[PDB]
Design an enzyme around this catalytic site. Structure first.
Site, PDB file in Angstrom:
ATOM      1  N   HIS D 145      44.082  40.848  49.666  1.00  8.87           N
ATOM      2  CA  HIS D 145      45.401  41.706  49.798  1.00  8.87           C
ATOM      3  C   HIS D 145      46.348  41.402  50.910  1.00  8.87           C
ATOM      4  O   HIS D 145      47.450  41.831  50.889  1.00  8.87           O
ATOM      5  CB  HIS D 145      45.449  43.034  49.464  1.00  8.87           C
ATOM      6  CG  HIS D 145      44.803  43.271  47.868  1.00  8.87           C
ATOM      7  ND1 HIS D 145      45.219  42.559  46.807  1.00  8.87           N
ATOM      8  CD2 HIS D 145      43.826  44.228  47.658  1.00  8.87           C
ATOM      9  CE1 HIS D 145      44.637  43.313  45.868  1.00  8.87           C
ATOM     10  NE2 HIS D 145      43.701  44.223  46.157  1.00  8.87           N
ATOM     11  N   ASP D 182      38.015  38.523  42.215  1.00 11.00           N
ATOM     12  CA  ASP D 182      38.286  40.160  42.315  1.00 11.00           C
ATOM     13  C   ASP D 182      39.312  40.263  41.273  1.00 11.00           C
ATOM     14  O   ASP D 182      40.303  39.639  40.742  1.00 11.00           O
ATOM     15  CB  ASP D 182      38.972  40.348  43.952  1.00 11.00           C
ATOM     16  CG  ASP D 182      39.044  41.923  43.945  1.00 11.00           C
ATOM     17  OD1 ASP D 182      39.998  42.278  43.296  1.00 11.00           O
ATOM     18  OD2 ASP D 182      38.302  42.303  44.872  1.00 11.00           O
ATOM     19  N   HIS D 184      41.820  42.542  41.303  1.00  9.31           N
ATOM     20  CA  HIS D 184      43.089  42.576  41.428  1.00  9.31           C
ATOM     21  C   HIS D 184      43.777  41.335  42.132  1.00  9.31           C
ATOM     22  O   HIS D 184      42.980  40.470  42.440  1.00  9.31           O
ATOM     23  CB  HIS D 184      42.876  43.775  42.659  1.00  9.31           C
ATOM     24  CG  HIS D 184      42.387  44.863  42.443  1.00  9.31           C
ATOM     25  ND1 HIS D 184      40.967  45.291  42.590  1.00  9.31           N
ATOM     26  CD2 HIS D 184      42.642  45.901  41.373  1.00  9.31           C
ATOM     27  CE1 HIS D 184      40.770  46.521  42.224  1.00  9.31           C
ATOM     28  NE2 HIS D 184      41.767  46.827  41.542  1.00  9.31           N
ATOM     29  N   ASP D 270      34.630  44.004  41.207  1.00 10.50           N
ATOM     30  CA  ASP D 270      35.319  45.071  40.453  1.00 10.50           C
ATOM     31  C   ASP D 270      35.959  44.827  39.242  1.00 10.50           C
ATOM     32  O   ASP D 270      36.331  45.836  38.664  1.00 10.50           O
ATOM     33  CB  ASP D 270      36.614  45.595  41.492  1.00 10.50           C
ATOM     34  CG  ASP D 270      37.340  44.378  42.153  1.00 10.50           C
ATOM     35  OD1 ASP D 270      37.217  43.260  42.030  1.00 10.50           O
ATOM     36  OD2 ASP D 270      38.183  45.100  43.156  1.00 10.50           O
TER      37      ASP D 270
END
Ligand SMILES: [K+]
Ligand SMILES: [K+]
Ligand SMILES: [K+]
Ligand SMILES: [K+]
Ligand SMILES: [K+]
Ligand SMILES: [K+]
Ligand SMILES: [K+]
Ligand SMILES: [K+]
Ligand SMILES: [Zn+2]
Ligand SMILES: [Zn+2]
Ligand SMILES: [Zn+2]
Ligand SMILES: [Zn+2]
EC number: 3.5.1.-
Lengths: 370, 370, 371, 371
Positions: D145, D182, D184, D270
């Protein structure tokens, strides 16, 4: 002549101490469940993690634990005890082993073998001269387990398994076990009660645990008479008392006995912040105790000294007490005790009359160590 | 003449003590973060939950905390201190207040007002005769906070705010604060140093915290000379020493002074299992201390006694120490201490010479209480 | 016309011993490491209670003490054999698993199971008499997975069924509805009332989430009870739009068709956006709207007699705000924001997807069989 | 032809101080109660490490020490201003939030962020030289991120981008691929290499899960980098069938088209069935198959040069088994079952739904622009 062994196994941190505080949780007694039992493995794991994070691990030789065999265990324990530990280890959620405060998790015999075996493997490598000394950061602890039972969080008597190995496999005629865990080493005392080939010494808070033992009059029997030495100290004893006990009793006892190997039952539950005793030792105290004992080993048994973790219940402070001992082994003194100033003004640094007298009670017993 | 008040507010359990052990976590010092700070609110919450689960709550009159006003706080503290607490309470993650071990969470002034206000509200209701006595199970604690600062986990001095209210609002001429938290009540001592209208008594472990105070020679000044009494006791002191101190010093001091209200700074950090001191008091000890003090109140100030929670750091054992005090208030003795037998054999039940002498040092000071 | 909202919390609801495992017990051979907080640990529901207090909602509620469910109370929903088996495990020195390998009861834990069922009963009694207009029983352990003859899925006794059985046998109600919006299929409740048209049982849930072999729309009851069990299985990823469409198209019309004298809501929050034990996307505002609709339905058809009884939910972070939203709809005092609202609102779930619409529409033809 | 699998764990990865909040900080006015374990608490990844050891997998791995990332290393992925800002927060007595209100750095935490990025670099170096055939860097804090000029979403530095920048500038590789699975969106990685065709950036993720405004298929890079960023947003509830269809239809063909000299995998777990921070249904067997496919692709196109770098994942219960499955595919020693397999296998995700298929098919026409 300088290589320091270090034992940690991941499973030492997986011991399942349950949902109780000391005994199990109990609704009728209104003992509410809690996440961390007093003996929860995080305390010792935090010590391991500090050994790594401090950089001490770079000066240590990692030594893998090797599971203690049935034959290894039987040098310290009965066949009946070993067989009983197999049984409770099989229970779906494990269970208490006998005394109502000694939980073994499901499959927990595996961990108990690795704990005893960590002590044995380090002992082997120090005794052969591959290593000069070491620290076995094992869990579960050992010194309360007598020949025929588990007791006081202890499944097998790790230091006695290691001593028995040194005797039977390495052919040593004389071994010493010096236990400075704050609780009486009753298990070790029991195992070698009749045996002068393992000198057993216990420095402890008088009647802290177990309730009915550790008196100076408990001296062994038969050929072992005179080869068990208890040094019960009063609650509130600190660095001055512990160092006086080392100088007046412990070190002279070792010099009289001439062990070929010294095993230290290294608990840190005598620390100033421990919930399970009332003593006032600081990391600098433990440092000085370790320095003295290592120097004694250098003088009398070619530096052959093995430290084996026993108790200690402050997750906050135990890591710094343990690190101080490791630093005395490596000679790399690279991190302060951040609690030093906070704890140093609380006292324990003056030898009180009652402390001096408790220690002096043991001095006449030194003459019976042949 | 029998109705027992009890204060708990949910927010007492929401105090944010951070991710450190004592001071903050610090990577350069290799102080690893931990879930439960020594002073974490779960300890006191477990006491509250035991009050409920034991059925004691059915014999108590619940009393809502009312937030202490600025005017209430200013009877014990400076305007500068109050204004500084507003500032740190505004920080997005809160922060330390001054001494490096006293964390206030974000919005935490709300909790500090409710804690002081819980003490005030119970005081009000006992003093008017609505209630005969009570227990204010507040958090954060108070006794280390002097007039102009926060210190030792304490934001405001709850018992002093309550005493100041009793003096100024209820028009009492004489109030006593008896602090049996194991640490010296330096804050309370400071606030009333020059003032004979609040007799301040502190039974504590000598030099445990703070490092430089609580000597018997600290006796107040001016018109307040003789109206502060410190009873420093040695590490390892247990039930025998504490009860001898009650019988020889504390109860005679109260009888000499004739307070119109007794406020007890009720800490349980003198317990046998506390990490933050080295004393040996058991729940039965605290029971006897409470019984004596309540009976004294019955004899000298029409039973007007208010207990206000101070320290104590065993989440395992503090609940049973606190419950014993509550049971002495209600007269309903319906649950055993499940640790009684385990702890009773560790000692502390014989008055040692050094303990006796420490207490006897204070007896000649009783004559100066007019 | 009356407004007094009951609230049940007992300290012991927070003392349930879920053990040292994650879901099943810790197991060294399987290398399942012990952990402090089991998925079902009581702190989640305790944090909801503490927020009810800290938010000031408690000041608008009438606290109602739990009264331990008697053997007779329990036997209206369960077998004598099940009750006797729960006494046995409760007696064990460290408690233990009940039947299914994921349902730990602590030592003495039967006391808590009785207080949990008894909390539901006591609130039901006081709403039904008119002392209270409605209420929320924040009980633990949960109930809806426990069938007539077993414990299952963290549930010892079926709290809502004990309460319904009381409403039937003691209060003489002829029709009761149990609306279960826990994200897992209410298989226990379905089982208990399978043959019985006097308790309409409705379960909105994630299809095949738990248990693995149940909650299909074809599970409709039997004999005289045929048509009086309604399952609404929804696909993973369903959010507020789907849940509200299910309420409007199926749940509320079912209740109106049935005309229960009392509505019991099995109020789980495990359909929340942050729950580990399901894959749904409901937010606190979603739960708010679900509660508002159901309470308004009760006002229209059974003089407002509605009792909420806590079921599952496993986010200690977010469950408290989902629960608080429901409490606020009961009290009418809307005094705290959901602090996660903006963070969660952009993740989706707020558009009715075709697959979600179709899953719900499958149940609409079954409404006609509710007489 | 060679087989030696590197593994990075540093004790300090477990010492990251995520604070006393759940997601954002605790806040009394908002009535967000403090909690011991933040969602991102380091115990989740530490439990993965401990299982690597306890399972015996560590005996088949070559431990590789993390070496702290230098300022020069960090500046290949980040601005000088960002680096300097991270020094500032790290110096605070209790640390603090970095930019975005959910990204706590502890006191001295920059040391851990350097060791995390440096773990990725050191493994990349040793795989690229041929000392190692492949490896897994179990780092923390995560990276994907963090864009060029900020910390974001628990990420201080973009570990995989620091490693790619090293492979480009120090090892002289002309083409590197970063495959981020991931759950996200890898917005940071996308940002860093936006204008740059020498690092192909691929992100398989739950659509709009985090961040809220990004990861659309239309985000394709710019200038010479146009076509060299590929987002594969998938719908909530997607499981093994969808993830494997995405691997077969998009990810593996993209890698084959691009011919990277090194593949770096941003390996988050995740997307697992039990994660609180997303709504996907991937099981350990799903992650196993994803890893097997990617490793086999590396064998075919870049002499097996593949480096896995830990990103997110928030189930302390289940993440360790998802991670262990990936490690087992690297070592080839498949010695422990997933003990949750049967429990999770019946929940679904194993059928490719039409909406899932369509989401994936949207990206297939973009493959032709990878030259
Ligand atoms: K002996
Ligand atoms: K000892
Ligand atoms: K005074
Ligand atoms: K005191
Ligand atoms: K039915
Ligand atoms: K349901
Ligand atoms: K790119
Ligand atoms: K991604
Ligand atoms: Zn000990
Ligand atoms: Zn104190
Ligand atoms: Zn559920
Ligand atoms: Zn992620």
């Amino acid at each position: 002549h300088h290589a320091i062994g270090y034992v940690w196994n991941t499973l030492y941190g997986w011991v399942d101490t349950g949902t109780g505080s000391l005994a199990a949780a109990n609704l009728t007694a209104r003992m509410q469940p809690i996440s961390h039992h007093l003996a929860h493995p995080d305390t010792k794991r935090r010590f391991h993690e500090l050994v790594c994070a401090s950089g001490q691990i770079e000066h240590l030789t990692p030594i893998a634990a090797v599971a203690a065999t049935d034959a290894d265990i039987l040098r310290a324990h009965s066949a009946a005890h070993l067989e009983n530990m197999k049984r409770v280890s099989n229970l779906p959620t494990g269970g208490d082993t006998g005394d109502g405060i000694t939980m073994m998790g499901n499959g927990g015999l595996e961990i108990a073998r690795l704990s005893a075996g960590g002590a044995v493997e380090l002992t082997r490598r120090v005794a052969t001269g591959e290593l000069s000394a070491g620290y076995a950061l094992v869990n579960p602890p050992g010194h309360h387990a007598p020949h025929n039972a588990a007791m006081g969080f202890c499944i097998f008597n790790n230091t006695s398994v290691a001593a028995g190995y040194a005797r039977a496999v390495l052919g040593m005629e004389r071994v010493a076990i010096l236990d400075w865990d704050v609780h009486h080493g009753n298990g070790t005392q029991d195992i070698w009660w009749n045996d002068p080939s393992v000198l057993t010494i216990s420095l402890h808070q008088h009647l802290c645990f177990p309730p009915d033992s550790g008196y100076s009059t408990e001296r062994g029997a038969g050929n072992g008479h005179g080869y068990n030495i208890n040094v019960p100290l009063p609650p509130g004893s600190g660095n001055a008392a512990y160092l006086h006990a080392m100088d007046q009793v412990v070190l002279p006892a070792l010099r009289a006995y001439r062990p070929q190997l010294i095993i230290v039952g290294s608990g840190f539950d005598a620390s100033m912040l421990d919930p399970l005793a009332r003593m006032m030792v600081t990391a600098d105290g433990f440092r000085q105790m370790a320095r003295r004992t290592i120097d004694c080993a250098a003088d009398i048994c070619d530096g052959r000294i093995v430290f084996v973790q026993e108790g200690g219940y402050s997750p906050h402070y135990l890591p710094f007490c343990g690190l101080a001992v490791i630093e005395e082994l490596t000679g790399v003194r690279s991190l302060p005790d951040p609690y030093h100033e906070f704890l140093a003004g609380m006292g324990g640094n003056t030898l009180l009359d009652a402390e001096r007298a408790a220690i002096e009670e043991i001095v006449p017993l030194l003459a019976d160590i042949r």
